[PDB]
Design a protein around this ligand. Structure first.
Ligand SMILES: [Mg+2]
Ligand SMILES: [Mg+2]
Ligand SMILES: [Mg+2]
Ligand SMILES: [Mg+2]
Ligand SMILES: [Mg+2]
Ligand SMILES: [Mg+2]
Ligand SMILES: [Mg+2]
Ligand SMILES: [Mg+2]
Ligand SMILES: [Mg+2]
Ligand SMILES: [Mg+2]
Ligand SMILES: [Mg+2]
Ligand SMILES: [Mg+2]
Ligand SMILES: [Mg+2]
Ligand SMILES: [Mg+2]
Ligand SMILES: [Mg+2]
Ligand SMILES: [Mg+2]
Ligand SMILES: [Mg+2]
Ligand SMILES: [Mg+2]
Ligand SMILES: [Mg+2]
Ligand SMILES: [Mg+2]
Ligand SMILES: [Mg+2]
Ligand SMILES: [Mg+2]
Ligand SMILES: [Mg+2]
Ligand SMILES: [Mg+2]
Ligand SMILES: [Mg+2]
Ligand SMILES: [Mg+2]
Ligand SMILES: [Mg+2]
Ligand SMILES: [Mg+2]
Ligand SMILES: [Mg+2]
Ligand SMILES: [Mg+2]
Ligand SMILES: [Mg+2]
Ligand SMILES: [Mg+2]
Lengths: 169, 145, 211, 159, 296
RNA sequence: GGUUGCGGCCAUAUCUACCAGAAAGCACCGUUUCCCGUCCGAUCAACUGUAGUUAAGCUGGUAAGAGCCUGACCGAGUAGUGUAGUGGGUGACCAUACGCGAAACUCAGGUGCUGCAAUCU
RNA sequence: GAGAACAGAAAUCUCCAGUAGAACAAAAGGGUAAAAGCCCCCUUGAUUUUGAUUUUCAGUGUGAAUACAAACCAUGAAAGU
RNA sequence: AAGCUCGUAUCAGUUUUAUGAGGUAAAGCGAAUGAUUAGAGGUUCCGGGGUCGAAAUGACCUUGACCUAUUCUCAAACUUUAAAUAUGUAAGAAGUCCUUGUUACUUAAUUGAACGUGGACAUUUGAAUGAAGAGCUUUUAGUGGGCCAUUUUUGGUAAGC
């Protein structure tokens, strides 16, 4: 059947991987602040590469999760950029999906040469009502198969509202 | 060694009676390669008691040879004759312990025939002398007594 | 410079195999264990004949390789390099030590000298399958290997169908009926347990209960 | 050189039992002890505070003192040619009650009955434990049951 | 699950299940170990727990001993017992928590003799205090908060229960800093605000702050109130007179039933399937190999 | 009998694929003024019990299911072992005597029991 | 395992599986999953008094440890530790 | 050696029954870890080679790795199971049961803990066997190079090592 086994978006998490720290980061940070509203979160390096020019614990990048209303806003506004056509690859077999765009300008937002230009990894995670159970504390159980967000049941939802294209094989 | 001590078999060719239960059948188990034994007849229980049968009275091995000795000591348990003893042995009485303890371990001489075997310290079944040879113990005893 | 085998024949010491403790140990002279048409099917060779030991002793790795060689060499050139499957059911896993030589006989603990395999009594060393039309050609093989070895060991006709667990007729029953299905160079059998699903997927040939 | 620590050699002694790791079940604590009870000693490997020394593993003594998280147990250990009295302060996880005594207790209270239930009757009791008596006779019929006669088999191989 | 996840035979074999009341995500044993267990020289002295749960709306207050056969409820009062005294709306709110706590406090203590002595605070400006032991004669009843899995945050309603069990004459040891109006940046309490939260003076000011800035929302939630004509203000008496109603008679009245146990027994075995005998199970397979196999 | 809060034993309770579930209870679920916590009211805190839902959680049933639990003169009185001999054998090793006696395998049967309190056609 | 600009085997973001296959200074072996591991919070019980106990044992010492008593404290809503 | 206090008394290199503890031998490896022979079946946008190719996140061969179900062989420093011999405790008068006092400990509480007062049931009073008895004290000798045999077993090719 089909009652409240709908399909909302769990959250939307943009992320700017920056091969360094400093001015270059805070900018990428700033960028994601004005874009999202919520003050963003930074991420330290996980170890040391030396051929990526990093040292462990270096504050390498930033990102931000946003859910509900304001999400779909920035989902569409960036789905705009990707001209509503993705790839069959882009969809996790566990139900979610994401994409990348260069230039944060391509989706509102001015230029300001004191901030520069950045890219974003746009990643959309779906889920259904009763997402809860597998994230609350008391009786943390696991949601049954006939409910688990799947790749098919997600391209289908995507193919519809947004009226965007799938592409590829 | 202890078990031989407990069954009062402290020297060679000396012999006793043993009431059979788990808790002694297991004792006998433990000492197969050192004793020979089996089921005594009526015939030889009499002769054991009659000829080399003695009673322990204030340690002191007192040789029986008159019914007054026995009544004097086993009389409290019934038992007032040298044959009353034998009864209380051969039948296992309500007083086998007191009955049997009373008689000093028997002192049998070497077999008058010979052990019949060529080497003693094998099992009966294996053509030796030790271990339980069932009623074949009467021919032995009777020749040692 | 290899020490005469008589030195280690008997299992005088507990299993000393190459380990994270051992480590320094050398390579085994017998490194291959299936010779002849080993890729062949169970039906392809019904006859099995064993080389079987009569002693609790140790078998030198070098003695193994050199014996495996002899009895592969013969069997082939006589009956044909595909006329048999020769398996070696014994592995040299037991490291032998030696005390090479100022010092005297203190701190004697040796360093690894060679491997050997530890055989029981009645334990098979070699197992060969063919068709019941090589028998002599096999058996004669094992008899010539016999010499490469210490200890009395003796040849035996297997009551079983080749390398299988199943004796001659009781095998046939499971194949002239439905339960056997090929695999590699051995075989799988129709289990009466578990998922009725894949149980009929595989072995479709069963389930009719005739030929 | 040699090495002889307090928990040495306790590889498999202080382990955990198969698929039995984890937080000790909650009854272990709910058990109550008094000065006098007989207790068996099994060290719980997970429970490092108030453990017992290995020697007392599998040993069994009497509670001589009760404290907050613990019981004082005494044990007759024997050094040299004699026994000394050792006192063990164990935690209530390393100790369980002893069914070596259940036999006895169950036998006195049952010996109470047989005794009373025969005095108010006609004495006639007999309530000491006798060992295993040899079997009295019996007759076995062959009706339905005729003897199947066996011989020893000859030598097969079937490897 | 995907083919490349999937549990091995080995895996399932060498696996050790947690308990059950932990697989169910219901019981924190680590706490239980330290709630349940008694000073080993206090012997059979029960250690009691003030159990405070929250259904998805309906508050649960059980007083409970422990027994190796299975924990023993001395007493139990639920927030859905709060008609009788005077509450029909908001029974998952802080103050119906205070009520239950008080109801739980007064109803046990009663069935435990210390009814007349140990009355706790009757006045309630909610100053910080603990029911103190009396000058000669019976120490109060002592009992510990079994907060369960509830997350200890300063202001949660789990503690409201506690403040009301403390008010109703129970010794239930507690520090103040989880009662609303506990100042963060100074170890210091404002009881003007706790005495608020006790009488629902946060719900009231929510009934008032919507009665003039949005009457759309006020209607949706706060519905039931309108249906009984109770606008804000009067809600402070509602609990005060609840209080009284409880302290006077908390003697627990059960439910009248209607239909017996055995009656419920019948109409439940209706919708209950049953297992199958091996003889049955045999045929099913046999029928399935007639079918699935023989080439249709 | 169900269900819930609290449990004891901690897989006969877990894993995998399906299906079925009244009534109540749980639950998913709505809201953000308040105490509270967050990069994000997802988690946590708070408010309503209203606006909605059996989809999932939860309960049970199905399966020559995996696992697991139990039994057996299934294997096997076998492997191993305590005791004995001026037993065999060049040895390696092995028979015999009085006792104790496994694991694997194989076959069958089983898939939570239940303590307190509250509630329900 | 599957997914996201530059981004590559290796950077960061997400989800699914995950009996511990990790981590807990060190050697190793025990032990640990709403912890004994990882992050955060507040602290000084690594404190004062003097007995008993366990190991090595002579049932001396030393080292190390354990459970109490008498204080003063830390933390937690609390039981507690 | 000297004795001393007692005596049916408590004693035991033994059994029995009841109840613990143990990871050796065996055993296992289509159970974990770690070794090890052999095929078979799958999987790569993806380890490398080759054919067609302008390339392909292209197809086809190819060999490797891994995954699946099988397969021969192992462990002092592996293990699910797990013996035999050995090993802790218990088999009453210092026992069991009723009544109801003491306290400063302890309980919500004369609750509980411990020690008690008053009462109740004798030798089938709580298995076997044995006992030229049992318990206790003081003081001093010699010794503190050892060797051998069966079974367990380490080193060494071995040894009358
Ligand atoms: Mg005698
Ligand atoms: Mg003559
Ligand atoms: Mg003559
Ligand atoms: Mg002669
Ligand atoms: Mg001789
Ligand atoms: Mg004569
Ligand atoms: Mg050696
Ligand atoms: Mg060295
Ligand atoms: Mg030879
Ligand atoms: Mg050492
Ligand atoms: Mg666990
Ligand atoms: Mg007593
Ligand atoms: Mg410590
Ligand atoms: Mg399998
Ligand atoms: Mg907690
Ligand atoms: Mg309903
Ligand atoms: Mg459903
Ligand atoms: Mg639930
Ligand atoms: Mg279920
Ligand atoms: Mg099954
Ligand atoms: Mg990236
Ligand atoms: Mg970290
Ligand atoms: Mg210090
Ligand atoms: Mg030291
Ligand atoms: Mg035993
Ligand atoms: Mg060991
Ligand atoms: Mg072994
Ligand atoms: Mg096994
Ligand atoms: Mg014993
Ligand atoms: Mg010296
Ligand atoms: Mg001296
Ligand atoms: Mg000298």
């Amino acid at each position: 059947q089909n009652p409240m086994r709908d399909l909302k978006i769990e959250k939307l998490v943009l992320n700017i991987s920056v091969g360094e720290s400093g001015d270059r980061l805070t900018r990428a940070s700033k960028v994601l602040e004005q874009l999202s509203g919520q003050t963003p979160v930074q991420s330290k390096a996980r170890y040391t590469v030396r051929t990526f020019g990093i040292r462990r614990n270096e504050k390498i990048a930033v990102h931000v999760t946003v859910r509900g209303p304001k999400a779909e806003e920035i989902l569409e506004r960036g789905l705009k950029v990707k001209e509503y056509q993705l790839r069959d690859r882009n969809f996790s077999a566990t139900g979610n999906f994401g994409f990348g765009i260069d230039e944060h300008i391509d989706l509102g937002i001015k230029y300001d040469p004191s901030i520069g230009i950045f890219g974003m990894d746009f990643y959309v995670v779906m889920n259904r009502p009763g997402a809860r159970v597998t994230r609350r504390k008391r009786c943390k159980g696991t949601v049954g198969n006939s409910h688990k967000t799947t790749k098919e049941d997600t391209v289908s939802w995507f193919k519809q509202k947004y009226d965007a294209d799938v592409l590829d094989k | 060694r202890k078990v031989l001590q407990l069954l009062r078999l402290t020297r060679i060719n000396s012999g006793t009676f043993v009431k059979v239960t788990k808790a002694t059948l297991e004792l006998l188990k433990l000492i197969e390669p050192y004793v020979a034994y089996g089921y005594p007849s009526y015939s030889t229980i009499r002769q054991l008691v009659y000829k080399r049968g003695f009673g322990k009275i204030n340690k002191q091995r007192v040789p029986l040879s008159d019914n007054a000795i026995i009544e004097a000591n086993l009389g409290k348990y019934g038992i007032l004759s040298i044959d009353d003893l034998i009864h209380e042995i051969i039948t296992v009485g309500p007083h086998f312990k007191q009955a049997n303890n009373f008689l000093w371990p028997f002192k049998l001489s070497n077999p008058s025939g010979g052990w019949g075997v060529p080497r003693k310290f094998k099992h009966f079944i294996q053509g030796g002398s030790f271990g339980n040879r069932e009623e074949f113990i009467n021919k032995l005893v009777k020749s040692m007594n | 410079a290899r020490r005469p085998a008589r030195c280690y024949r008997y299992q005088k010491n507990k299993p000393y195999p190459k380990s994270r403790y051992n480590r320094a140990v050398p390579d085994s002279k017998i490194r291959i264990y299936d010779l002849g048409k080993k890729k062949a099917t169970v039906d392809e060779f019904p006859l099995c004949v064993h080389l079987v030991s009569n002693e609790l002793e140790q078998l030198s790795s070098e003695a193994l390789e050199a014996a495996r060689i002899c009895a592969n060499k013969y069997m082939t050139t006589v009956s044909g390099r595909d006329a048999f499957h020769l398996r070696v059911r014994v592995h040299p896993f037991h490291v032998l030590r030696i005390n090479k030589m100022q010092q005297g006989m203190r701190g004697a603990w040796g360093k690894p000298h060679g491997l050997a395999a530890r055989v029981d009594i009645g334990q098979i060393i070699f197992s060969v399958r063919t068709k019941d039309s090589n028998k002599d050609v096999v058996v004669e093989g094992l008899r010539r290997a016999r010499y490469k070895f210490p200890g009395q060991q003796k040849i035996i006709l297997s009551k079983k169908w080749g390398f299988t667990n199943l004796d001659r007729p009781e095998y046939l029953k499971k194949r002239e009926a439905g339960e056997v299905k090929d695999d590699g160079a051995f075989v799988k059998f129709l289990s009466k347990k578990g998922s009725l699903e894949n149980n009929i997927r595989e072995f479709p040939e069963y389930f009719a209960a005739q030929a | 050189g040699k090495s002889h620590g307090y928990r040495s050699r306790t590889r498999y002694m202080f382990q955990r039992d198969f698929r039995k790791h984890g937080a000790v079940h909650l009854s272990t604590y709910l058990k109550v002890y008094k000065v006098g009870d007989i207790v068996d000693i099994k060290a719980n490997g997970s429970i490092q505070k108030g453990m017992p020394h290995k020697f007392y593993q599998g040993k069994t003594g009497v509670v001589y003192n009760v404290t907050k998280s613990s019981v004082g147990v005494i044990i007759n250990k024997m050094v040299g040619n004699r026994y000394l009295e050792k006192r063990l302060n164990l935690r209530v996880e390393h100790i369980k009650h002893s069914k070596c005594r259940q036999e006895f207790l169950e036998r006195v209270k049952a010996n109470a009955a047989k005794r009373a239930e025969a005095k108010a009757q006609g004495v006639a009791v007999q309530l000491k434990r006798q060992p295993a008596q040899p079997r009295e006779s019996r007759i076995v019929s062959t009706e339905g049951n005729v003897p199947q006669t066996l011989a020893p088999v000859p030598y097969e191989t079937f490897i | 699950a995907f083919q490349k996840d999937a549990k091995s035979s080995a895996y399932s074999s060498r696996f050790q299940t947690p308990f059950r009341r932990r697989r169910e995500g219901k019981t924190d044993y680590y706490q239980r170990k330290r709630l349940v267990t008694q000073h080993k020289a206090k012997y059979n002295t029960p250690k009691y727990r003030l159990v405070v749960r929250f259904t998805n709306k309906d508050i649960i207050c059980q007083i409970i001993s422990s027994t190796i056969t299975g924990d023993v409820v001395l007493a139990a009062a639920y927030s859905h017992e709060l008609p009788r005294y005077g509450i029909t709306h908001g029974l998952t709110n802080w103050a119906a928590a205070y009520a239950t706590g008080l109801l739980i406090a007064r109803r046990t203590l009663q069935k435990l003799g210390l009814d007349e002595t140990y009355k706790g605070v009757e006045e309630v400006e909610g100053e910080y205090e603990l029911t103190e032991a009396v000058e000669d004669g019976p120490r109060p009843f002592k009992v510990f908060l079994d907060i369960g899995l509830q997350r200890t945050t300063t202001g949660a309603r789990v503690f409201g229960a506690l403040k009301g069990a403390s008010d109703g004459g129970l010794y239930v040891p507690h520090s103040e800093n989880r009662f609303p109006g506990w100042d963060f940046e100074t170890e210091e309490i404002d009881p003007e605000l706790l005495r608020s939260y006790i009488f629902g003076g946060h719900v009231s000011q929510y009934m008032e702050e919507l009665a003039d800035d949005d009457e759309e929302r006020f209607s949706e939630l706060f519905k039931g109130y309108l249906a009984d004509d109770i606008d804000a203000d009067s809600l402070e008496d509602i609990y005060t007179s609840a209080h009284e109603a409880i302290r006077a008679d908390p003697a627990f009245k059960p439910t009248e039933k209607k239909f017996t146990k055995e009656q419920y027994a019948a109409e439940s075995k209706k919708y209950r399937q049953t297992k199958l005998s091996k003889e049955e199970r045999a045929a099913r397979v046999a029928a399935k190999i007639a079918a699935l196999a023989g080439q249709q």
